Ligand binder design. Structure first.
Ligand code: ZN
Length: 474
């Protein structure tokens, strides 16, 4: 039977960690139909991967693209760096459920302006009707749960409200969500205590779903923050993921030796724990005035009242206005910024941890976004692998494909084997690299030759009509 697609002459890195091998890949009906010698096998479409690596499409485990499938459907920032699947709904904020009227959170800005969906069924229904460019898996945000269940999201939950959040989570999981996420460093999630988080974790654990977490603090209290989420995992048995693990500010550089040691103690005990990072020593999120005098070079990524300030340093803005930085930060609100506060050598060491995946944490609606939006995966392949030799290409690809599939429960994805979905990326190992910079954060990567999502090409030429992405219902 004729193949729908075939990629020949290249070297296959299947995601299992096994050594790259010279073989061709055949696709039919959206799945990998065969692997081996296909030179003379007829196919509707064919790519010459000579001198290239053929690997499973990359899985971005830390996306905030929840509302982009409707707002900016091209998702070019993902496809251009080899991403074929994204896990959205991170750091406590998700597309659904919708908050109670009048309930809001600054962190919701990490998603966009599109009105949130009533519930996961509605969100997934919207995605089925308007298929995404790439595959989409979704987490339900703890912030959403609180904002949807509590008349006063700043208080302690009543027994009924706690049960309401658990029931909302249960419904989301039954609908296909892969778990729930927390944003303990943000309001209103920060108000939550152990009992509240454990309750949700029990619901997730019972269904073998995840608890991903943007921990309480990633600076002076980073060790306590990691211990807090590990305690929840050890007590409930809920699989856990520590989002964009890092140590902010010089006095905290190196503390990942302690946090990773704690993570290791937890996984040795049987708790499923993983983590992820983006390959940059600067973070990016909402502008926090309390950091005005603790971190230098705070650079604005967006500002509703002062859009002219995107790309500018808080200190320069303050000096120009004749006020202090904290005051300037308050006048810029609501806004976002980049915080250059990590040690690149530490980011690299964290990535080397056996359970570390890659999460771009791109913020698609920012006027002047952090470059991780467009160059995370290719920066790992070019800077961390080819340049720094932190691990082999085979090992790195595994971190971007098979490991995420294992952690998030994606059957028939993340590996190049017959029968699995044909999410594939073809790239030149010697040239693959990010081009997005701090000044020009939207420059596309180089070295990515082609990308297939469920057997259909999305890069370099995206589909004219319906897109090939699927909602990955757990
Ligand atoms: Zn986060």
């Amino acid at each position: 039977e004729k193949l729908d697609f075939k990629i020949t002459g290249g070297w296959i890195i299947d995601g299992t960690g096994a050594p790259r091998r010279r073989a061709d890949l055949g696709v039919r009906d959206g799945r990998i139909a065969a692997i081996g010698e296909l030179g003379a096998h007829p196919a509707r479409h064919a790519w010459d991967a000579s001198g290239k690596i053929v690997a499973p499409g990359f899985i971005d485990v830390h996306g905030h693209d929840d509302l982009m499938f409707v707002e900016k459907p091209d998702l070019r920032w993902k496809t251009s760096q080899g991403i074929t699947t994204v896990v959205v709904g991170n750091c406590g904020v998700s597309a659904a459920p919708a908050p109670l009227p009048g309930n809001t959170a600054a962190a919701l800005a990490l998603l966009g302006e599109t009105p949130l969906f009533a519930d996961v069924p509605a969100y997934f229904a919207a995605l089925d009707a308007q298929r995404p460019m790439i595959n989409v898996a979704a987490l339900v945000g703890h912030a959403n749960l609180r904002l949807a269940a509590m008349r006063d999201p700043q208080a302690a939950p009543t027994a009924a409200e706690q049960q309401a959040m658990q029931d909302m989570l249960q419904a989301a999981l039954e609908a296909g969500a892969v778990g729930f996420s927390t944003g303990l460093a943000y309001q209103p999630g920060a108000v939550a205590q152990a009992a509240e988080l454990e309750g949700l974790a029990r619901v997730a654990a019972e269904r073998r779903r995840l608890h991903t977490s943007h921990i309480r603090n990633e600076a002076d209290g980073v060790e306590a923050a990691v211990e807090e989420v590990l305690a929840i995992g050890r007590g409930t048995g809920c699989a856990t993921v520590v989002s964009h693990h890092k140590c902010m500010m010089p006095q905290n550089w190196g503390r990942s030796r302690a946090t990773l040691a704690n993570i290791d103690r937890a996984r040795e005990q049987g708790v499923e724990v993983a983590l992820d990072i983006y390959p940059y020593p600067g973070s990016s999120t909402i502008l926090i005035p309390e950091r005005a005098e603790t971190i230098d070079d705070i650079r604005i990524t967006w500002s509703t009242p002062h859009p002219e300030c995107s790309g500018e340093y808080l200190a320069d803005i303050a000096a120009r206005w004749g006020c202090d930085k904290t005051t300037a930060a308050r006048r810029l609100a609501p806004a976002g910024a980049i915080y250059f506060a990590m040690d690149e050598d530490e980011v690299k060491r964290i990535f080397q941890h056996p359970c570390c995946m890659v999460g771009s944490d791109g913020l698609p609606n920012d006027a002047r976004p952090h470059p991780r939006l467009w160059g995370s995966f290719t920066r790992v392949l070019g800077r961390y692998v080819r340049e720094a030799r932190l691990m082999t290409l085979e090992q790195a690809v595994a971190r971007m494909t098979a490991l995420p599939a294992r952690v998030f429960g994606f059957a028939e994805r993340g590996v190049l084997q017959p029968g699995a979905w044909a999410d594939v990326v073809v790239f030149d190992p010697d040239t693959v690299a990010d081009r997005a910079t701090w000044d020009e954060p939207t420059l596309a990567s180089v070295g990515i030759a082609g990308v297939l999502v469920n057997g259909a090409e999305v890069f370099p030429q995206p589909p004219a009509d319906g897109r090939p992405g699927q909602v990955l219902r757990a």
